[PDB]
Design brief:
Blueprint (H helix, E strand, L loop, with lengths): L3 E2 L7 E2 L4
Antiparallel strand pairs: 1-2
PDB class: plant protein
Keywords: solution structure, Schisandra chinensis, plant protein
Assembly: monomeric
Length: 18
């Protein structure tokens, strides 16, 4: 399983995915 890149300000990879 791999995380995804959140389009949020920090733009950091997250498993939650936003």
């Amino acid at each position: 399983i791999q995380c995804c890149r959140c389009q949020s300000w920090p733009y950091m990879c997250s498993v939650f995915c936003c």
